[PDB]
């Protein structure tokens, strides 16, 4: 039996606007005699919401339990813990969670990389890259858009933050989007929305397009006059 | 199933903010349907006419005296549809309100405009209401097309093209320059329906203001 | 109709347009063109609001600080509406005058001993008071 | 992927990406060499295999090496050697540089 308890990141707080706590329980045999319980630091009980999923190929059951407490209590530093009781387990399991304190805030940078030239010669697909780097702490939320409407989640894959070898205390992440070659040659526009706590306005946006990229021609023109001292 | 007679948005500052209160036949109760996206909040705001939905969230219930019962049907609404009457609802059944949370909604202040400084109205400086504050509009781009749109909204008749000779009788302003680079092409219905720069960003001075004189 | 305007600066009189030409027929062999048009004044001085300033004979045009966006935009996230910063890069010198702007100055006028300072119009016509 | 131009403009460092996809099963090893000399393992960060949602049965990963701005400007070369059983010689290489690109033109006109 394995029990995983993930805390609610600021990415979930930004969108869901609701702070919920989940205690994943794996490798479960008897689901008719289980209890997912949530308690505070003093011993008070919190109303839980236990949902039993479908079956698994390895004859195991997964327990998903949500507990909701609004952000005023959680961000203050109070500690929580998860308890899973089983008739086969002589002793209930105890797993505690809490948010760390005392980390500096550094503003992240956003980089959009156009697709490689050697990829579009195959007439198959393209790959756009949204790069976010140098941020603390390690929390980031990236979402792609087109024409103001959210894209399907599968069209893109986002990874977890990873440490930066050249700078202690800073991390980075990536995002990859796949589109058709004819769509990119047509001239459609894309957008990378990135949200992090350290931003001045908490949300940043960049846009890439075929026309506004690397030009082969630089038709520069300069006109000299001694009477044009103003421009409309 | 009950048909909502209206929404009131009680327990909030004004009537454009607060808790969603669906009017049930006779006595009315609060609703906490799941999947409460901004689309339903837009229809709720359009019910009152406040303006655009800006935010929706569910708040923890800590002795908030939620005496109002909860509804027993969902209100999946596309947002672009009409009043709450015209959007599908589930066939009664159980409630989706597992966690006891109230539904919040934040509409926006409606638009308004007027002329200040001119006799018997229909003349003077232009003031536009937004965020509960009046402000001036920059004259960097004020064509004749942008003059008639303001005039008909207040029912002051077609503008008589007064030039700038009589535009010195109103003077400058002191308020924030809310709008800039306003370009109104068609009649539309309101000045906000045109293309502008942004609310609060400008490159003008109170000396350069907009004065509009209609027929009256 | 086939060109899109990116910047239309007036102080530096800079204007940039981009256009894609369907050269040949292979979609992967179309060139991207960038046009820059600059009009330089030869009679304006260092400070356009001070006639006593010396003449200007050096012009610098940075293209990274010209094609920059500095106005928060609205983004819909299906649960709220937020304002987003377009760029993080966001005292610039105005080489030429702007038609949509008025330029004035203060000058001492002496007559019968008394001195009356009066607002002037450095620009020929520009706007009216 | 050649480094971002704005990152270089601000003059701190550069980002080189080695994007490898379309291999099965999940077994891949990427390295970074400069001028024929392999670099230390503490110079690049290696990702992990993970399935592609679009085409099932395909995995992909990447590796990034940060270089100094002066080192990138001096003209040094970099490459991303990859190893996979399915490859003919089990070794494939892609190489980029500062000069990697397409020749441009300058149609300057001066109207006196
Ligand atoms: C260019 O000229 C302007 C106008 O003289 C200078 O700004 C003025 O400075 C005086 C005081 O020295 C103030 O009384 C004015 O209000 C200022 N003008 C404005 C529009 O605010 C400006 O400093 C000069 N620039 C340089 C580099 O000398
Ligand atoms: C050079 O300018 C001419 C027009 O003066 C134009 O026809 C031509 O395309 C320009 N060259 C390039 C490489 O764009
Ligand atoms: Ca003006
Ligand atoms: Ca303006």
Numbering used by the authors:
A (entry chain L): 345 to 576
B (entry chain N): 132 to 347
C (entry chain J): 2 to 91, 97 to 135
D (entry chain K): 457 to 568
Give excerpts from the publication.
The human Fcμ/J/AIM complex shows the binding of tandem AIM SRCR domains to IgM leading to sequestration and stabilisation of AIM.
We expressed human pentameric IgM core which includes ten copies of Fcμ chains from Cμ2 to the C-terminal tailpiece and one J chain, as well as full-length human AIM (hAIM). AIM engages pentameric IgM core with 1:1 stoichiometry. The global map resolution is 3.6 Å, with local resolution at the interface predominantly ranging from 3 Å to 3.5 Å. The density of the N-terminal SRCR1 domain appears only at lower contour level, indicating a flexible connection to SRCR2. Polymeric immunoglobulin receptor (pIgR), a component of secretory IgM which mediates the IgM transcytosis through the mucosal epithelial cells, also occupies the cleft in the IgM pentamer when bound, and therefore pIgR and AIM cannot bind IgM at the same time. Similarly, it has also been reported that AIM does not influence complement pathway activation, consistent with our Fcμ/J/AIM structure as the binding sites on IgM for C1q are at the tips of Cμ3 domains which are distant from AIM.
